[PDB]
Design an enzyme around this catalytic site. Structure first.
Site, mmCIF file in Angstrom:
data_model
loop_
_atom_site.group_PDB
_atom_site.id
_atom_site.type_symbol
_atom_site.label_atom_id
_atom_site.label_comp_id
_atom_site.label_asym_id
_atom_site.label_seq_id
_atom_site.Cartn_x
_atom_site.Cartn_y
_atom_site.Cartn_z
ATOM 1 N N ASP B 90 -13.420 9.416 22.941
ATOM 2 C CA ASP B 90 -14.493 10.348 23.289
ATOM 3 C C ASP B 90 -15.149 9.943 24.609
ATOM 4 O O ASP B 90 -16.332 9.638 24.686
ATOM 5 C CB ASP B 90 -15.489 10.352 22.146
ATOM 6 C CG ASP B 90 -16.602 11.343 22.309
ATOM 7 O OD1 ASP B 90 -16.474 12.255 23.161
ATOM 8 O OD2 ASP B 90 -17.609 11.219 21.583
ATOM 9 N N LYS B 92 -15.419 11.820 27.417
ATOM 10 C CA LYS B 92 -16.166 12.861 28.110
ATOM 11 C C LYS B 92 -15.953 12.773 29.629
ATOM 12 O O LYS B 92 -16.903 12.722 30.422
ATOM 13 C CB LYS B 92 -17.652 12.870 27.739
ATOM 14 C CG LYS B 92 -17.889 12.991 26.243
ATOM 15 C CD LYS B 92 -19.328 13.330 25.919
ATOM 16 C CE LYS B 92 -19.551 13.804 24.483
ATOM 17 N NZ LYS B 92 -19.109 12.793 23.494
ATOM 18 N N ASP B 95 -15.725 14.281 35.968
ATOM 19 C CA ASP B 95 -15.674 14.009 37.402
ATOM 20 C C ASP B 95 -14.676 14.960 38.048
ATOM 21 O O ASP B 95 -14.042 15.794 37.376
ATOM 22 C CB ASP B 95 -15.355 12.523 37.625
ATOM 23 C CG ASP B 95 -16.100 11.908 38.816
ATOM 24 O OD1 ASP B 95 -16.133 12.549 39.904
ATOM 25 O OD2 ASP B 95 -16.622 10.776 38.659
HETATM 26 O O1 BMP Z 1 -22.386 17.471 21.068
HETATM 27 C C1 BMP Z 1 -21.975 16.311 20.819
HETATM 28 C C2 BMP Z 1 -20.780 15.775 21.295
HETATM 29 C C3 BMP Z 1 -20.347 14.532 20.846
HETATM 30 O O2 BMP Z 1 -19.230 14.041 21.115
HETATM 31 N N1 BMP Z 1 -21.204 13.766 20.017
HETATM 32 C C4 BMP Z 1 -20.745 12.430 19.567
HETATM 33 O O3 BMP Z 1 -20.530 12.470 18.156
HETATM 34 C C5 BMP Z 1 -21.097 11.290 17.538
HETATM 35 C C6 BMP Z 1 -22.284 11.663 16.688
HETATM 36 O O4 BMP Z 1 -22.623 10.498 15.955
HETATM 37 P P1 BMP Z 1 -23.684 10.576 14.745
HETATM 38 O O5 BMP Z 1 -23.009 11.315 13.602
HETATM 39 O O6 BMP Z 1 -23.932 9.125 14.418
HETATM 40 O O7 BMP Z 1 -24.934 11.273 15.242
HETATM 41 C C7 BMP Z 1 -21.448 10.327 18.665
HETATM 42 O O8 BMP Z 1 -20.371 9.428 18.975
HETATM 43 C C8 BMP Z 1 -21.689 11.254 19.850
HETATM 44 O O9 BMP Z 1 -21.397 10.601 21.077
HETATM 45 C C9 BMP Z 1 -22.386 14.303 19.552
HETATM 46 O O10 BMP Z 1 -23.118 13.681 18.758
HETATM 47 N N2 BMP Z 1 -22.723 15.536 19.977
HETATM 48 O O1 BMP Z 2 -19.806 16.487 43.005
HETATM 49 C C1 BMP Z 2 -19.303 15.337 43.043
HETATM 50 C C2 BMP Z 2 -19.842 14.216 42.416
HETATM 51 C C3 BMP Z 2 -19.286 12.961 42.636
HETATM 52 O O2 BMP Z 2 -19.786 11.892 42.224
HETATM 53 N N1 BMP Z 2 -18.087 12.864 43.387
HETATM 54 C C4 BMP Z 2 -17.487 11.524 43.592
HETATM 55 O O3 BMP Z 2 -17.583 11.185 44.975
HETATM 56 C C5 BMP Z 2 -16.329 10.628 45.434
HETATM 57 C C6 BMP Z 2 -15.661 11.569 46.404
HETATM 58 O O4 BMP Z 2 -14.577 10.849 46.965
HETATM 59 P P1 BMP Z 2 -13.779 11.436 48.237
HETATM 60 O O5 BMP Z 2 -14.704 11.327 49.437
HETATM 61 O O6 BMP Z 2 -12.592 10.513 48.346
HETATM 62 O O7 BMP Z 2 -13.370 12.863 47.934
HETATM 63 C C7 BMP Z 2 -15.488 10.353 44.194
HETATM 64 O O8 BMP Z 2 -15.683 9.025 43.681
HETATM 65 C C8 BMP Z 2 -16.015 11.367 43.186
HETATM 66 O O9 BMP Z 2 -15.861 10.893 41.857
HETATM 67 C C9 BMP Z 2 -17.559 13.979 44.003
HETATM 68 O O10 BMP Z 2 -16.552 13.905 44.733
HETATM 69 N N2 BMP Z 2 -18.177 15.158 43.797
#
Ligand code: BMP
Ligand code: BMP
Ligand code: PRO
Ligand code: PRO
Lengths: 257, 257
Positions: B90, B92, B95
């Protein structure tokens, strides 16, 4: 009534991490953040040492470092202190508050122990910030909220961007600014950092889009450019960094007038 | 014209990872995903072994595991194969495409090497999916898109949710479903996984909000419940998992009618 970086560093509501950053930007005449998007610790450290004088900030993705250890981060801190730049781990926390607190403090990276700044997406609602600040406030850290993105099809527009600004302005004890393409807040205490920057027009084959330093700092009102490949893929990374620094700095000066 | 999980596993456009999941859900009579939100490898593995028969999936946050190694993940795979459940990291991803490809394949976690499923936020635009699929398609992996969130103030609503559904339906070679609070797609080839689930009403102090298995599976039309603290904070985690499994499974049956 636009203030210099050095004057913004003194504003009554400034966050201490923002103040430190703004002061070193003014001292060093740099508003360049290097996006050190490399997989080897030695390359990361060699870039940080050579480019340190040219940058206000070094942005990491530690989760792409093949040979990460905490001792690498200790060596990075030494360089940051020597050359005077902040370390920004670009983790894009984006979970519920209870989860992100653990992701920020713990695991193998222990991000909060070495990163001056982190960032977060606002999509989960403000619990993402409240969870991070449980760790980051005791550690005197700051956070940036992602209000806009540079990539094709970004959904960080309109009311989403406005929600990010409101979330920042309601968590100003911890949130010091934004990742954005432009000035999004009218409050000078907030920093605006803009990625998607190159001197030449174009993009990549995975949705990146570029604008120039003059456009983003000068026209769009941002404070700092974040530059990855425009520097790191160049042969001479030091001269490339200097070209980006001079571009961003002059764009800032011309806009203060 | 609602199909059983076993029939959905045979649909013409089903992704092979979704088909494997749906078949084991039907075989084992479970639509429970354990959210194994622990910091110790031994606890992770002991939960996976004991609860493996009760779950269709084990969701990890490897970045909170204090003692992560790749050999821990090898042991988790052994348990997943033995007990027949998928591993969902998970992470997420959230980027630009060029960055997430590296975060998925590389670094110290090498997520793509052990995770059957990962997930992504849609806020960057579809390059986030295109970057992940550069790694995940050769490795026969799947991805879930975050279309809604359970937390207070979530911005994953309205047109954002619709954009997530469109992005999934345009990347169906890799995207197998959604993290959502409800059924968001009318296409039965897509899985709906719902976190924010407990038997009792309430929430946490960092924006989590709970709904019951009967509500989310039965009324809201989701397929799988994701449960963390409702299981892991209980004394007897096996009996807790069984209570959640029975709740989610009966809610599914009653809705097929
Ligand atoms: O909308 C979302 C998306 C998620 O992945 N999660 C994830 O699901 C889990 C929820 O855990 P819990 O049942 O202990 O509240 C966590 O790992 C959290 O990062 C969430 O709670 N809500
Ligand atoms: O809107 C966004 C937000 C970011 O952090 N970034 C980050 O900034 C950097 C852009 O790198 P580059 O200049 O090589 O395209 C990357 O590390 C990327 O994860 C982005 O490019 N756009
Ligand atoms: O977009 C353009 O035309 C100019 C040329 C270099 C960068 N910006
Ligand atoms: O919300 C309610 O009232 C019921 C009680 C247990 C879970 N759902």
């Amino acid at each position: 009534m636009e203030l210099s970086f050095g004057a913004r560093a003194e504003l009554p509501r400034i966050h201490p991490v923002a103040s430190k950053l703004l002061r070193l930007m003014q001292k060093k005449e740099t508003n360049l953040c290097l996006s050190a998007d490399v997989s080897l610790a030695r390359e990361l450290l060699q870039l940080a040492d050579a480019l340190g004088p040219s940058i206000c900030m070094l942005k990491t993705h530690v989760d792409i470092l093949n040979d990460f250890t905490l001792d690498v981060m200790k060596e990075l801190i030494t360089l940051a202190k020597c050359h005077e730049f902040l370390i920004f781990e670009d983790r894009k926390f984006a979970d519920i508050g209870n989860t992100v607190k653990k992701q920020y403090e713990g695991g193998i990276f222990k991000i909060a122990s070495w990163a001056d700044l982190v960032n977060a997406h606002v999509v989960p609602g403000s619990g993402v910030v409240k969870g991070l600040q449980e760790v980051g406030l005791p550690l005197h850290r700051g956070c940036l909220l992602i209000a806009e993105m540079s990539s094709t099809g970004s959904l960080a527009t309109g009311d989403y961007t406005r929600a990010a600004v409101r979330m920042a302005e309601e968590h100003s004890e911890f949130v010091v600014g934004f990742i954005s393409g432009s000035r999004v807040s009218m409050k000078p205490e907030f920093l605006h950092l803009t990625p998607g920057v190159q001197l030449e027009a174009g993009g990549d084959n995975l949705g990146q889009q570029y604008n120039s330093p003059q456009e983003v700092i000068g026209k769009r009102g941002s404070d700092i450019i974040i530059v990855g490949r425009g520097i790191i893929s160049a042969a001479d990374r030091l001269e490339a960094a200097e070209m980006y620094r001079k571009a961003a700095w002059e764009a800032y000066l011309s806009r203060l007038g």
